[PDB]
Design a protein around this nucleic acid. Structure first.
Ligand code: HEM
Length: 493
RNA sequence: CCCCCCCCCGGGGGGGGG
RNA sequence: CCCCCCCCCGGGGGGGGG
């Protein structure tokens, strides 16, 4: 038996209804399968519930050849009568599109229904996707944590009794692990799926512990009630070592960006002169040590270096810390600005309010008055001059993170906190998915990044590392920038 | 119930890359 | 740790014999 301890913050049996850029769902990574997986810095489509695919010459039609003999979980709440087929695929994508099955933040922010025309079953083992125009990002989005396949047989039985809410309370998937029992925001008890379509899970029983706070997580670990500890307290990390023979640490870089956005609804914030000066006033180097204790990189980029689309070696930032230039342009302007901070646990921010004080301090030195406000996620959904946020993405295709944050389509949404719209940026972004090749795609993505780093719609603060601690007994631990953790590969020695 | 071909999975052996 | 070929096992589909 293995125990995985992590935060109750962001816990869901459905990453589709969850707010985008906030989590990597460690639970749905084990109980649900996608059509494809992408687990390499080359973005190679690993076939999962889809054996293979082919794209029409014009680029507007994708055919998915689905795997045979795949069966859904046999749980107390559901007992399947048939194998996985095209009907389960058709139901799952049509739901997020808003089409006949007979708010999805991620899929809304990438505008899937504007990408996809139709998803239809040709054979029981063949699905046809119609596209409005060629999109080289479609299968990467269907390779993401958000594109899990649900049971059509289960949803038909649930819709029979108005019970379709149960889908997210009592799950049924094709994953290597199966849900046994749980208590909300406390624990999840997983059991190995015996009739899995791939190499079977090595550990029969896994418990996902959500109960303990960030501080007492390493406490529970060293008390041996916890064999893998995820997201530990940042100050506690500097107490640990890599020499120890009873525990090891594993870090990973990726798309985990903390940033500051300018509200472009504020006539002052639409001024490039003040935006470039505010950035010059911020000592982002000093923030990385006080907030992240060497578990982050000062970010002068939006696309991480682990992305296939990082062809720029992140050049020197033209609006980096210089308080003398900042003091001149801002003090004489006599500015007072409302800085909002989302009051929640952030994966890109261990201490978001502490950082908001360090920003309030750095800006006062250059003659800017900042008034920080603790704001809730739904209150924001219902005014700020600056907001402190970020993005965590496993999908390292910049269509999945740069489009939600900076595109015109998402301006009046929670994803684009800048309320920015640049038709030249949208130009590069649209171009980057009409071309199918990585050379062509990375060129347009670096052009858009270069535009973002000069127009300054956001100030990138940190390149954050996801950390975990594991016991020496536990082998088969592989932390990747591409997703959560695969519990299938875990085993004791 | 017995026998071919295709696809997929798992295992073992030979070869190739860090 | 990643990738070829051979062999074996299991599963799914098409074909052939009582
Ligand atoms: C490789 C170098 C290792 C050294 C030098 C080492 C040393 C020790 C020491 C000194 C203790 C007593 C507590 C202490 O004062 O540290 C201990 C206990 C223990 N060690 Fe190790 N250890 C090593 C590797 C491992 C590994 C790989 C495991 C995997 C299980 C392991 C499992 C344990 C366990 C479980 C205990 C507690 C008693 C027990 O469970 O049998 N050790 N070891």
């Amino acid at each position: 038996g293995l125990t995985y301890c992590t935060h109750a913050s962001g816990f869901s049996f459905n990453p589709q209804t969850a707010d985008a850029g906030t989590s990597m769902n460690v639970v749905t990574e084990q109980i649900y399968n996608k059509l494809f997986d992408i687990k390499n810095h080359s973005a190679t489509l690993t076939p999962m519930l889809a054996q293979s695919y082919s794209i029409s010459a014009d680029g507007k039609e994708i055919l998915l050849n689905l795997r045979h003999g795949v069966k859904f979980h046999q749980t107390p709440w559901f007992t399947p009568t048939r194998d996985f087929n095209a009907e389960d695929v058709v139901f799952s994508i049509n739901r997020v599109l808003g089409h006949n099955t007979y708010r999805f933040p991620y899929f809304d922010s990438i505008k899937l229904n504007e990408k996809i025309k139709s998803v239809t079953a040709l054979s029981p083992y063949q699905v046809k996707i119609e596209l409005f125009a060629p999109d080289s990002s479609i299968l990467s989005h269907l390779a993401s944590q958000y594109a899990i396949i649900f049971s059509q047989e289960y949803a038909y039985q649930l819709s029979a009794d108005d019970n379709l809410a149960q889908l997210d309370t009592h799950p049924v998937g094709t994953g290597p692990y199966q849900v046994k029992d749980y208590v909300y925001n406390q624990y999840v008890r997983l059991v190995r799926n015996e009739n899995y379509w791939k190499k079977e899970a090595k550990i029969e029983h896994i418990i996902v512990d959500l109960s303990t706070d960030r501080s007492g997580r390493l406490v529970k670990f060293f008390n041996n009630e916890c064999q893998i500890a995820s997201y530990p307290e940042v100050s506690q990390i500097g107490l640990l070592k890599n020499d120890d023979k009873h525990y090891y640490m594993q870090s990973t870089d990726g798309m985990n960006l903390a940033y500051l956005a300018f509200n472009f609804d504020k006539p002052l914030m639409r001024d490039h002169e003040i935006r470039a000066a505010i950035s010059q006033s911020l000592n982002r180097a000093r923030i990385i040590h006080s907030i992240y204790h060497n578990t982050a990189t000062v970010a002068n980029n939006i696309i991480p270096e682990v992305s296939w689309a990082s062809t720029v070696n992140t050049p020197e930032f033209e609006f980096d810390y210089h308080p003398k230039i900042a003091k001149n342009k801002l003090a004489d302007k006599n500015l007072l600005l409302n800085l909002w901070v989302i009051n929640e646990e952030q994966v890109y921010n261990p201490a978001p309010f502490k950082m908001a004080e360090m920003i309030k301090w750095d800006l006062a030195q250059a003659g800017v008055k900042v008034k920080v406000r603790a704001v809730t996620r739904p209150f924001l959904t219902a005014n700020y001059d600056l907001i402190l946020s970020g993005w965590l993405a496993g999908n390292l295709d910049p269509d999945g993170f740069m489009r939600p944050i900076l595109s015109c389509g998402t301006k009046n949404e929670l994803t684009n906190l800048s309320n920015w719209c640049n038709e030249e940026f949208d130009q590069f972004m649209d171009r980057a998915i009409t071309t199918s090749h990585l050379s062509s795609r990375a060129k347009a993505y670096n052009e858009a990044q270069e535009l973002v780093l000069r127009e300054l719609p956001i100030i990138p603060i940190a390149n954050v590392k996801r950390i975990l601690v594991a016991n020496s007994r536990v082998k088969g631990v592989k932390m990747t920038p591409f997703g959560s953790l695969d519990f299938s590969t875990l085993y004791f020695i």
